[PDB]
Ligand binder design. Structure first.
Ligand SMILES: *[C@@H]1O[C@H](CO)[C@@H](O[C@@H]2O[C@H](CO)[C@@H](O)[C@H](O)[C@H]2NC(C)=O)[C@H](O)[C@H]1NC(C)=O
Ligand SMILES: O=S(=O)([O-])O[C@@H]([C@H](O)[C@@H](O)[C@@H](O)CO)[C@H](O)C[S@+]1C[C@@H](O)[C@H](O)[C@H]1CO
Ligand SMILES: *[C@@H]1O[C@H](CO)[C@@H](O)[C@H](O)[C@H]1NC(C)=O
Length: 863
């Protein structure tokens, strides 16, 4: 037994031969660091009893427990395996207790499979019976993708474990954590997953959300696969250099999906087809957002808003944190410090901006006839609180307002209550979107104001290595009771259920609009409802660097609108760090500068009306806004097809092994390469330039670099931005708000490849109506350039923007001088446009043209 393949039999304590012998495992203390001294033997677990049975969907097998001493308690004697060949690219298998119903995640999107095994499978499944293992191989090359035979199946009531070999070390995903790098360290690493309010720092703890998905790039051909575990109990995932991964959970069932794709993008698409593709955001949510904890007063907030508006900062959204509230209570505002809040909301709206308000789940229980607190009275009337273990008394904890009860968003009636609270509050403050926070759920006491009873839920036989080592730390008692079940089973689902309930509330408060929901805690599928931010980071260079893997991983998870707090939540931010973070932050799919309580101001204009930081911030935000039609179309593809938005280099450049661990650069979609300076004092960045033609975004000059590491010169006012040859990028003249920018002239940037060809697309709808994609009210056009000729081709034409939008500029990169430029409309000539040519840079710009959005054109030229 090769030491890299040993599966640890003593995860719970310092390894001893005595414990090893008792557990019937193998003892060998002579390995390298982290190699398990005690590891499972060749036959520990389950065997198949009798024959497999064909079903319409796949097959079932009965697994029988081989005799073994009970380590983490009540072992499951008869296990049922149910396997379903759900699609050509997705396999589903579950291990359940044959004679008892167990908790299964009540997911809102995923449904039970009815139907027949798919035809033309890209995979094969192989079951070994003595001892049990399950293998999933790729049919084309027989590559073993999933293979549980490396370790036992373990299945006790509060301890379930299965391992899989992996075909490579290119492993990406799992969450929510700060991994620091994007490609996984496979060198004996354990990642705990249990929704927790904790600082995203260098300690590798469980954080706000629970994401069990990972993607593996098998080799340079691009062939990739993914694995998702549908389980919401506390768990940890163990990575080792075999390479192999082990999932270790403390309840529910092992419900696994395996996805195959021809590229990393296709694996993500397969995962999202299962779990739910992300919502198409409101176009305004793609703009820049500004926020802080404790402006203190509306006057102070209003002063910040005004100096950034005075600076002409692209600036769509203002967030109001708990300081707007009357003593930190939801659905109120402070009538003294925030007197005139409704007038301020009108000011934002008149300026073409949006208000996003924070709402916390926990509700103050302080109410009397003397001073009623409406949300609590109404919630108690409807009996929609999380209860203590007696099943009848609302659990009391403590959050921002003091003592609180917690809504049980798993109860359908709770969404009715929540909806009414928002309707009532929206009648006072006409906010545009909702930021749901502290929804792990976060509790300032451990469990409840009276602690937690000692029992198998609060104190289980095995505890994954979660921060502080107790499940109820800074959250609710594990024996608290909700509609879907006990907190032990549904804790990781709280913020998911809250986001589902908040989207329901939006149906009434914002009829037929998308609005915007931003959530802290997530589960698999949360992106269908909400954006995410990476939580309470710190103003350090480490946090700046660590942000990029976090953004890429949430894109894998189908929450593409993701970003950190730009400049750093905790601590005063250094000018240089904030300047670099604003440059990079202009390109986070969710772009928000947010700051903690009491720290020095870090809004862009606070650095000086004429400062390098403000100038550069404005410059790069103006570039972001210019590329919004491109970014929005990327979101359209995430929503409709399941593509990533912020995308790892390796998803486009998988043939090139130098991209497999790149985490200091990323792409927008296939075509825009972003190269930030991430090191203090630096005016350079060591960067990778992939195997494509690349053009400097601002000058349009073709770089000489290709497929190579470079030292990119990036002075204090620059971030690297390069356009990929072969792509056509739709643009729109920027303005300080997207309300205004969407009325502006459009442009095309044609970045020619080595063959002088390029292709692109543009999605365009009204930017805010819900279901425009499902109801087919949108424009989708395709651009292609193949020598001497641009074609604009319309594939869907069921929305026509009333603002007379047209492409009034075409910039062609990598071209010899165009002559005789001719424009045809539906094949019919043809006015001569203006052409400007830079012969040193090989850039042509065509102007004095008006190609109406939604019409077919051909633009032809000679050389
Ligand atoms: C939490 O406890 C409350 C009682 O405090 C339960 O309320 C019941 O709710 C239903 C309406 O759905 C009513 O038919 C019952 O009359 C209520 N019971 C009482 C005693 O008033 C509530 O069901 C509990 N929640 C959970 C998840 O168990
Ligand atoms: O006092 S804090 O440190 O700021 O509290 C944070 C943690 O709960 C934890 O660090 C401490 O409670 C334990 O020391 C909490 O997450 C802040 S919330 C999310 C943020 O984005 C909003 O601006 C804040 C107000 O709504
Ligand atoms: C930009 O927006 C302002 C409103 O903030 C508007 O007055 C102005 O005309 C817009 N500029 C255009 C049309 O580019």
């Amino acid at each position: 037994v090769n030491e890299l393949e040993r599966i640890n039999c003593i995860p719970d304590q310092p390894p001893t031969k005595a414990t090893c012998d008792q557990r019937g495992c193998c003892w060998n203390p002579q390995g390298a660091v982290s190699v398990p001294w005690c590891y499972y033997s060749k036959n520990h677990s389950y065997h198949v009893e009798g024959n497999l049975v064909n079903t319409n969907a796949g097959f079932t097998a009965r697994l029988k427990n081989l005799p073994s001493s009970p380590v983490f308690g009540s072992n499951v004697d008869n296990v049922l395996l149910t396997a379903e060949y759900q699609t050509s690219n997705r396999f589903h298998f579950k291990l359940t207790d044959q004679t008892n119903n167990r908790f299964e995640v009540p997911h809102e999107h995923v449904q039970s499979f009815s139907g027949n095994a798919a035809a033309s499978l890209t995979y094969q499944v192989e079951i070994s019976r003595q001892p049990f293992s399950i293998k999933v191989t790729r049919r084309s090359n027989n590559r073993v993708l999933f293979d549980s035979s490396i370790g036992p199946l373990l299945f006790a009531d509060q301890f379930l474990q299965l391992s899989t070999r992996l075909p490579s070390t290119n492993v990406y995903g799992l969450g929510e954590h700060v991994h620091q790098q994007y490609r996984h360290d496979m060198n004996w690493k354990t990642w705990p997953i249990f929704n927790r309010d904790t600082t995203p720092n260098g300690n590798g703890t469980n954080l706000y959300g629970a994401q069990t998905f990972f993607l593996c790039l098998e080799d340079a051909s691009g062939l990739s696969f993914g694995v998702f575990l549908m389980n919401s109990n506390a768990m940890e995932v163990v990575l080792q250099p075999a390479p192999a991964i082990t999932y270790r959970t403390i309840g529910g069932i092992l419900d696994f999906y395996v996805f195959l794709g021809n590229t990393p993008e296709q694996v993500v698409q397969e995962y999202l087809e299962l779990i739910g593709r992300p919502a198409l955001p409101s176009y305004w949510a793609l703009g820049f957002h500004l926020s802080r904890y404790e402006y203190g007063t509306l006057d102070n907030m209003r002063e910040v808003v005004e100096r950034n508006r005075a600076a002409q900062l692209p600036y769509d959204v203002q967030h109001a944190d708990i300081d707007y509230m009357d003593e930190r209570r939801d659905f109120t505002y402070d009538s003294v410090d925030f007197k005139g809040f409704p007038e301020f909301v009108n000011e934002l709206h008149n300026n073409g901006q949006k208000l996003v308000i924070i709402v916390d789940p926990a509700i103050s229980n302080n109410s009397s006839s003397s001073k009623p607190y409406g949300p609590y009275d109404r919630g108690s009337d409807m009996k929609i609180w999380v209860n203590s273990s007696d099943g009848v008394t609302p659990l009391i904890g403590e959050v921002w307002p003091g003592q609180t009860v917690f809504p049980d968003y798993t109860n359908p009636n709770c969404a009715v209550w929540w909806t009414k609270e928002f309707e009532l509050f929206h009648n006072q403050v006409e906010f545009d979107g909702i930021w749901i926070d502290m929804n792990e759920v976060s509790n300032f006491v451990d469990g409840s104001v009276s602690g937690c009873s000692t029992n198998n839920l609060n104190n289980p036989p095995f505890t994954p290595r979660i921060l502080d080592g107790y499940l109820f730390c800074k959250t609710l008692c594990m024996d608290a009771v909700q509609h879907w079940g006990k907190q032990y089973d549904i804790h990781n689902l709280y913020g998911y259920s809250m986001a589902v309930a908040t989207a329901e509330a939006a149906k009434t408060v914002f009829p037929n609009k998308r609005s915007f929901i931003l959530t802290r805690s997530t589960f698999a599928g949360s992106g269908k409802f909400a954006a995410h931010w990476l939580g309470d980071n710190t103003a350090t260079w480490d946090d700046l660097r660590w942000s990029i893997p976090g953004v890429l991983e949430f894109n894998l998870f189908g929450i593409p609108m993701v970003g950190p707090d730009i400049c750093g939540f905790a601590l005063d931010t250094p000018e240089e760090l904030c300047r670099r973070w604003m440059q990079l932050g202009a390109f986070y799919p969710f772009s928000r500068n947010h700051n903690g309580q009491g720290y020095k101001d870090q809004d862009p204009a606070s650095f000086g009306a004429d400062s390098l930081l403000l100038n550069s911030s404005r410059h790069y935000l103006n570039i972001r806004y210019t590329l919004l039609p491109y970014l929005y179309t990327l979101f359209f593809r995430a929503h409709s097809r399941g593509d990533t938005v912020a995308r790892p280099l390796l998803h486009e450049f998988y043939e090139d092994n130098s991209t497999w661990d790149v985490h200091q650069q990323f792409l927008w979609g296939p075509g825009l390469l972003i190269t930030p300076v991430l090191d203090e004092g630096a005016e350079k960045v060591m960067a990778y330039v992939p195997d494509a033609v690349w053009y400097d975004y601002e000058t349009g000059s073709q770089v000489r670099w290709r497929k190579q590491k470079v030292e990119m010169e990036l002075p204090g006012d620059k971030i690297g931005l390069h356009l990929r040859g072969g792509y056509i990028f739709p643009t729109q003249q920027p303005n300080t708000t997207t309300l205004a920018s969407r009325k502006n002239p459009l442009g095309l940037i044609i970045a020619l490849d080595e063959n002088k060809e390029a292709k692109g697309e543009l999605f365009w709808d009204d930017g805010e109506t819900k279901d425009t994609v499902a109801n087919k009210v949108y424009l989708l056009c395709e651009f292609s350039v193949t020598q001497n000729r641009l074609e604009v081709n319309i594939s869907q034409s069921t929305y026509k923007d009333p603002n007379n939008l047209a492409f009034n500029e075409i910039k062609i990169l990598g071209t010899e001088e165009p002559s005789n430029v001719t424009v045809k409309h539906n094949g019919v000539p043809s006015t001569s446009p203006t052409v400007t040519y830079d012969s040193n840079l090989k850039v042509a710009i065509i102007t004095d043209i008006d190609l109406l959005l939604g019409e077919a054109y051909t633009v032809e030229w000679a050389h």
